[PDB]
Amino acid sequence: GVLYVGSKTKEGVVHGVATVAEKTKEQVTNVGGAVVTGVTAVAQKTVEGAGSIAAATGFVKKD
Amino acid sequence: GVLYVGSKTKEGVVHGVATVAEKTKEQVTNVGGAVVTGVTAVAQKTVEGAGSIAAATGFVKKD
Amino acid sequence: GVLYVGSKTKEGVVHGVATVAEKTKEQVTNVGGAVVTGVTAVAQKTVEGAGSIAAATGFVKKD
Amino acid sequence: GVLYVGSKTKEGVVHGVATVAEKTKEQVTNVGGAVVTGVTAVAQKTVEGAGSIAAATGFVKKD
Amino acid sequence: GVLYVGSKTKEGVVHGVATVAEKTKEQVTNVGGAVVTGVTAVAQKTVEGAGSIAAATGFVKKD
Amino acid sequence: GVLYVGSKTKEGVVHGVATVAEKTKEQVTNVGGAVVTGVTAVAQKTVEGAGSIAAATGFVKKD
């Protein structure tokens, strides 16, 4: 196929993943996997075949 | 196929994933997998074949 | 096929996923999978074949 | 006295004196004197005392 | 006295004196005197005393 | 007195005196005197006393 992306912008401002926590006890923050951010953000064919992208968090605290 | 994206913008502002928590006990934040953010954001064929993208959170606390 | 997206905007402002929690005990926040955000946001063929995108949260707390 | 002018505008467009003539024989154009133009235009005490502002045109053609 | 001018604008466009003539024989164009143009245009006390501002055009053509 | 001019602009465009003539025989263009142009244009006390500002054009053509 053919993928054409043409962006003609002026004064662009982009925020991606933003997390804020305050006055807690246990803080776990897992970010990633295929995070793509930007004024022109293009993601194509992130997973092909039997691959995997697992941004997982196994919180247990098995008291 | 043919995918054409043409964006002609001025003064664009984009926020993606924003999380806010306050005065808790246990905080778990899992973000990702295929997060795409931007003034021109294009995602094509994120998963092909038997692949997988599992942004999972296995909170247990099995007391 | 042919997918044509033409956007001619001025002063665009986009918020994606925004979560707010306050004065709780256990906070779990799972975001992602195929989150796409932006002034021009295009997602095509997110899953093809036997693939899967499972943004799941297995809260248990089996006391 | 006290003269307070507060203007809070967005995307203002101002045209002042515009003259158009076509297919004539004799063209005389006199503009001025106290012409004031702009998004915020303030004129105060243009003439004080025995002064004068005479934007005059003495066309004669005394054949 | 006190003259306060406060202008808070965005994307201002100002044209002042614009003259257009076409297919004539004699063209006379006199502009000036106290022409003031701009996004924020302020004129104060243009003439004080016995002064004068005469943007005059003495077309004669006394054949 | 006190003259305060405060201008807070973004993307300002200002044209002053613009003259256009085409297909004539005699062209006379006199511009000036107190022409003031700009995004923030301030003119104060242009004439004081017995002074004068005469942007005049004495076209005669006394055949």
Side-chain angles (χ1 to χ4, degrees), chain B, chain C:
Chain B
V2 170
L3 188 140
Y4 184 104
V5 178
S7 151
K8 190 170 178 179
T9 187
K10 157 183 185 174
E11 198 171 2
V13 173
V14 185
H15 293 260
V17 179
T19 62
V20 163
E22 186 175 12
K23 295 156 161 51
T24 81
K25 300 191 51 178
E26 285 85 4
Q27 162 74 48
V28 183
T29 303
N30 191 74
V31 185
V35 184
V36 179
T37 318
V39 174
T40 310
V42 178
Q44 193 206 46
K45 297 167 175 172
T46 313
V47 167
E48 279 196 307
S52 91
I53 296 180
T57 289
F59 194 100
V60 174
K61 201 178 178 176
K62 187 172 299 178
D63 268 12
Chain C
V2 170
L3 188 140
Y4 184 104
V5 178
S7 151
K8 190 170 178 179
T9 187
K10 157 183 185 174
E11 198 171 2
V13 173
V14 185
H15 293 260
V17 179
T19 62
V20 163
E22 186 175 12
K23 295 156 161 51
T24 81
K25 300 191 51 178
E26 285 85 4
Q27 162 74 48
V28 183
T29 303
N30 191 75
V31 184
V35 184
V36 179
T37 318
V39 173
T40 310
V42 178
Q44 193 206 46
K45 297 167 175 172
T46 313
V47 167
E48 279 196 307
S52 91
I53 296 180
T57 289
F59 195 100
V60 174
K61 201 178 178 176
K62 186 172 299 178
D63 268 12

Side-chain angles (χ1 to χ4, degrees), chain E residues 1 3 5 7 9 11-12 14 16-17 19 21 23 25 27 29-33 35 37-38 40 42 44 46 48 51 58 61, chain F residues 2 4 6 8-10 13 15 18 20 22 25-26 28 30 32 34 36 38-39 41 43-45 47-49 55 59-60:
Chain E
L3 188 140
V5 178
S7 151
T9 187
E11 198 171 2
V14 185
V17 179
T19 62
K23 295 156 161 51
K25 300 191 51 178
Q27 162 75 48
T29 303
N30 191 74
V31 185
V35 184
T37 318
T40 310
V42 178
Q44 193 206 46
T46 313
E48 279 196 307
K61 201 178 178 176
Chain F
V2 170
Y4 184 104
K8 190 170 178 179
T9 187
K10 157 183 185 173
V13 173
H15 293 260
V20 163
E22 186 175 12
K25 300 191 51 178
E26 285 85 4
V28 183
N30 191 74
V36 179
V39 174
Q44 193 206 46
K45 297 167 175 172
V47 167
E48 279 196 307
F59 195 100
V60 174

